[model samples]
Target: LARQVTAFNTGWQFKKGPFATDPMRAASQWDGKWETVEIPHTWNAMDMQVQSGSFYEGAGYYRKTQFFPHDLEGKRVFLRFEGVGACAEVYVNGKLAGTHKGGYSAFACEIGTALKLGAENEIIVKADNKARPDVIPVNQNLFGVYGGIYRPVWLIVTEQNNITVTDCASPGVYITQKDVSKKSADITVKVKLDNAGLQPAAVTLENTIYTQEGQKVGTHSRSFDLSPQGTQTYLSTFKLKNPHLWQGRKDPYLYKVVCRLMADGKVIDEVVQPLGVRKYEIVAGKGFFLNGEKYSMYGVTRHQDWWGLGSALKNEHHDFDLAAIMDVGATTVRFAHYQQSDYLYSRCDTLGLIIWAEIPCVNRVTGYETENAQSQLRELIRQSFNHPSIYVWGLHNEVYQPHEYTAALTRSLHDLAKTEDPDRYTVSVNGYGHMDHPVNLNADIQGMNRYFGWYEKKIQDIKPWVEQLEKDYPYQKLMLTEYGADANLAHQTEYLGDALNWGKPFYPETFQTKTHEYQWSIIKDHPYIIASYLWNMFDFAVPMWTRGGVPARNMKGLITFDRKTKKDSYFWYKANWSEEPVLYLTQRRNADREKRTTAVTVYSNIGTPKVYLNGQELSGIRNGYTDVHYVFDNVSLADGKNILKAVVSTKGKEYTDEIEWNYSGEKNREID
Candidate 1:
């Protein structure tokens, strides 16, 4: 719309649970008893964290009074919902406006015909998170389904002749690159225009290109004729010489496209989209290459829920999460199971973090779920198409059970993703049970979520599995989509045991560290494995889980849920994967000891580190198989408090780390 957008996030009345009559039809039901709350609000944020099966799943109703000025009398108004769980029924002024299914993507409904201008107008929304066979997530998996309007809601006002937003709630503009290279590149932009009035209109569709540094590079403009109450598409092409290429992480660059609808030489409506000029391809028998350079990508998966907030987060929380992921030396991120907020994708665009975005068509697709899955897939692609950070379109996650309709559904989804945006590769994450299953190999890149050293197999079995998969399918690209064990910071053990017994409460943090070390050791040496993303970046909320010394939470994150304490494994990755200098003492939290003599371990990237005991130098640092780890043997400690430290000098810079341990002067023991 020559459009004006407003944030409809404040002063909303909310109520949880079921209602006999639909709330959208009953104005008397929204009494003063309804609690006032801010949007991006959810009813399950508190109960989902309770240990004793206290999570709630049902319907929620939201009502508000919106006042519009007289200036918006002849304009078309739309109520745009960013997200609502499961399904939603929207009403304006006590009349049913529209209905939408699927909660992750955004949808907008026209309310111009039902609006009472210059007065207090009522808006009602009923969001339900109930489980149904026809929905995308028909069954519960590892994550919880929180109900209500968990994302932003917007009020849009536009003129009669303007840009369209009803095209599946998309930007109504699609941009793609062709014949891209460092020397020259071609950009094709397609925009849709809608005329809502009964009369015909004419306008000039203008498209301008700007570099990352806000420099104008190119412009294209054309006049188009629109029919009465009809829509038309305008296409334009621009060429640039010596364009800046978006090299993943090394030299990430972005261009901006500003599209304007001009009537009588004045702007009516405009939209801005980010463009990343780059090319990527996954080569068989080799790794992934970005901008024609081979690059090995390492990263972690992320869930949108937090410790106390179940998918109800602000932009500040998203900023913190992305900053933490960047600090860990991760080059990629997999927004698992479902689509995330728009703020995250924008941050990835600026930070050069590659993304694998998907819908919530998770485990056990039912008989009536294919249509919903296809709809969500198309919406995800259309909404996130302009972001250069998104390189892979994820179809599904861990769909193991084979049904009569499974093969056809998988093929359809893969084909749809390619058709919607052929610039990106389509990928799926399959469970270990279906690692080699025929139904799982419908995508261009095959990914398997095999949990060795935690679920069933040994830690060293990752290499053999990769070899067998390569031998069977020599032409397809492969990646490890998910692999990690759970660990609680409170659980500390002196002796190592089998990580397969993960249902107990004593799953120690050290075991998680060891599992990552082993899996990364096996994965780093194999060039055939194109990419690897750990199971999760942070511990997330799962209302049904009650393991790993915690209830209703998954402790497989490298960082704790509160974002306060980073486990020992966090520094382990920083030392190995990052170019930043790192020197961290392992097990520094185990402060108390019963032995006077013990072995000390340190994680450092420096070539040679020196260990000292109470200001006395023991010896020069000894390498422990890899340059990331250093260990000291038989270091004697004083009877009371003992001081331990490690020092290293590299690139004319010195770094040091210190810790203190208490010894009891009792019998010496070996703790490894």
Candidate 2:
């Protein structure tokens, strides 16, 4: 497609309306005052303060004009929109052209006939990001689905006589390694192109495979001609007799796959893809296996939100997010609810992290909207087919749809995925009733977004839930996709939840500390569970209506809100997840002078770890994972900063970490 100035500006007129009446005949139509902003903007980002009307739902009026050049008289003119957000209606000069329902997917209308000859044409689009129960997101999403043209709008000029449509465009062409024990494998390549006019359209196509360093490994070339108004399907096969296997996170090797479409000698479109040649399986009675070895998804689910960036997060923000997870030794990542930016997938491919990509087909779905959800899913799959980091495809996340339809939808989606690309598996959250959910029963593997410690119950229930799931579904591989609680480490000064004006006794410090301990307890205690991705990586500032319209950080992360400060729970998990030596002196506050019990919890992942205070070894304190006690022997100190170091060693690797704390004597009794 050619890039030109097709912005939503000219040949358009607009009017606004209230909740009760049509604006076309209303007095507001003649007001003649509207904001002239650019297309594909999120109004919510521009206005950040509070408002009364649709704090999360509202309507907006938009208009634009489309025209054709005089020289392109007999050529076809089509107006396309990559995405329109909620609802969209298009008009050509005064005629209703077309309408599309889904907000995320792309759709278009033909304005060729709607336009008057030798005259400038006009177009109008009206979109509302309102919270309608029948639409996508279905009021189950955590963030607002803003209205207007959220994505780009385009006016394209295509040849009426001959054309090509690259239906499935991905980074790499998908080809699976079948009959591995044998010396050869077959790859099915799907290609489609159409010839519209009364003449044959001759085209040449080339498929090339290369190493990561750009050395050509294999090549395939073909030439064909399609009859007038004819559709052609192309299927080709290749062989990789003895191929290098791709491994997850630990041993990542990637290849480059290229496919080019050419008409005569000119190249039309080309696809560049990243390929990981690997084998994996969810074996019965065994955990996930990649390259004949066991693998676990030890990571966290990430949502795209930075302190002030909102959803338009930048690369530096993601670098910090990924570092937080990888620093704590997480090997997997789940893009919760909806698809994330492309950089994340590429980062995973390089960093060796297994990815679970999903859509925002979230809670309280309706029947008619299923079609919209599937359309979005098809685009998601077709676009995300090449990245090897994507090992699992999640259909829905804690959604409420019809039992039968959802089941069949899950099955059909899984079947389609396997048909197109069999390298990955399909799965969904825990099942509801009567539907025989295919994700839990027939998915190559099993996954559940259980909140054992949040949303429903206490931390003590996690072990039992894991135990029951493993015992009941022993044959299926296991993963706890979502599990964590909302906490306010920054609210350490006031009574917890008092930030929201709640009652006292809400600051149950014991339970607050236990939530993290319990999560680690499960991670260390359960050997049956293959992986456990924590509910989140950092605290995100969300709108009120979140967790009953309360304004606070969604506190389920190992790190604090700033992403620079690591909380007490952060140190705990870092100790347990790292197999390398960990000597972390974590307390930043001085020890009390008169206190009888001075406590320090030194946690570690491998080998025995010891804690030392001011160069004195605490006796009987062996491994960090075990609780350590320092009686202090009635020794007291004045108010000042004190340093403590923990020396850790495992398999000949050694490291030391130090912490400084200030003592305020007996004047300060509470811990911040």
Candidate 3:
């Protein structure tokens, strides 16, 4: 059976809301001829600071005219928005097409029946993106989710006898490995066909596995039985005699798996996916093993959004992150709290980085809108079934409120993910709550984002808790997902000690140095954990105006606001992790001299950053960034954290910065 089909994804015009009007008189229709803009573009990319906070909720609308070719007549036409932010009302040719209330899922509207093909057709989507209670994160803990179609909108086209889109293939096609050993690997291909055509079409599916040498190692074929009108599924399997498994950092080799759809012995469409022979399992006897090696994850948790760019960072930014991760010597990367671009998984396959992907189910477990939360979680897994980089499918992050209900949802989502892709494991990180909760106790692996010396005290509380968790949940593997302190290399200790600073006060030269010593002491003392991704890799443009009204500020980062500038902590981490001699500590604006060693501590990345005073090397033994001591033992005293005029050099070049100190410690009492 066959039916005609067309897509309404092109030729869309847009209109901006009233630029100068009160809430009372905002323009409803286009005041001028509409501007021609593309779909899938975030408004934040155009207006940077508008969506930073809660201001832009229910902010505006996007209207476009979609034209269908006259040849598309008598064909089934549908308008599809891949992802519309928040609330939306879609129209086709000046008529209501459909409405949606979610920001992360795909929605389609039937428009062929209402089309005037010879004339220009219009498919307009009036979208409202407010942070509603029924929304995920419960309208809180949200940084800045941009409004508009944050993803691409597609006008899908097909022949009268098109392939029936099944749930398996609705997210395209999936390729996975079943049985794998040191010798051979068994590859499985599953495809779901969505039939948009009228008559039933017998579709053929083909899977081919290729080796690195450009030779076809294996092949499998299958056919789907489609009902004259609806969707159906098909599966194909092949065995590779010798396969190269993808391993991160060590030897990142990814194999290619080609999927082809055939009709009447001709190729209709095709997809190229990855089929890497990588083995990961949580063993009852041992622990989490990758390619027969028990590997612990050592990486950072990353939020997809970055400075200036919200989710608008599609491909380029992801590549930036991958580059940054490699430069930092990490084997694992966690796409925190949400599903990232699919290409990231493919890159991880070739780059050899293990991945931990999750949904945006955020801090609140059971919320005012639990159903939508569950929906997002389900959609995440079903869409990301093919990639081999995803080792664990995170069920929730920082789950709070409605404990038992959220637990049930987690288990259900876990079961659903396992049913679709049975090889992956499901886990969640305990947030402001206790890890000992019965909900977390049952998870396959236990992870905790426990902040020891940051928000909640009891820096001393971590060891005993880990001991207790191990004793209580003896069978489960454990990981410390997150930990860090707020240490800014600005301001003075006097200005920072205030509780009102929220531990984010600008530090005095003395306090800034000591804070690094303290935090590292805590981190080094507690290496019993699996991995620790510090608070953040870089200081991001928060774009948040709280105390005053400025967007550019640094509350937290190892590197300063400009990623090129490194703080004392950056070198500290380099010394601890990189094993280099002398690291370049970033130049600070004003520093204290009395606390010179502690204040401007430059840990050696390879060895130790040798300090030479006016080209004269210090004779006394002093090592590490924390070894900042008074010069009374070797040389004369200087004034203030800025007293030290010495040059801090590394790798044959010098970083210039001023330090202050008092010769007699007089400034300590009378400086202000």
Among these predictions, the greatest lDDT belongs to 1
Ranking by lDDT: 1, 2, 3
Tens-place lDDT per residue, model 2, 1-672, is 221225442333434444436666454554657656664454554222132123444556677654456755655566666565567787676688787665655566656656775667666677776666555666623655545665555665544432232342232244445543224445445555555557776777677778777899787888876667555656556677666556776667777766676776776556566777666566644566776677765677776655444444456777778877777777878887666656667788877888888767666556556566666677667667767788887777665447666666666666766765666777666633222354345455556665554444555666777777667766566666676655455333212121222232222222344466656666656655666677677766444333312243355666655676676566666666655445554334223333423555555555455656556766555333234211222223335655667676655777676775555634432342
The residue pairs in collision within model 1 are: 2-268
- Model 2 TM-score on a 0 to 1 scale: 0.78
Q: lDDT at 102 for candidate 3?
A: 57
C-alpha RMSD of each candidate structure in angstroms: 2.7, 5.7, 5.4
Residue 148 lDDT (model 2): 60
lDDT (0 to 1) per candidate: 0.82, 0.58, 0.58
Candidate 1 or 2, higher TM-score? 1
For model 2, what is the alpha-carbon lDDT of residue 313? Answer: 44
lDDT of 3: 0.58
- Tell me the deviation in Å of residue 276 in model 2: 2.2
TM-score per candidate, in order?
0.95, 0.78, 0.81
Which residue ranges in model 1 land beyond 4 Å of their true spot? 20-32, 433-435, 498-500, 594-597, 619-621, 634-637, 665-672
- Model 1 agreement with the true structure over 472-550: per-residue lDDT tens digits: 7777788888988887777654456545576556677767887876788777877778888897789988777677657
| Backbone clash total, candidate 2 | 15
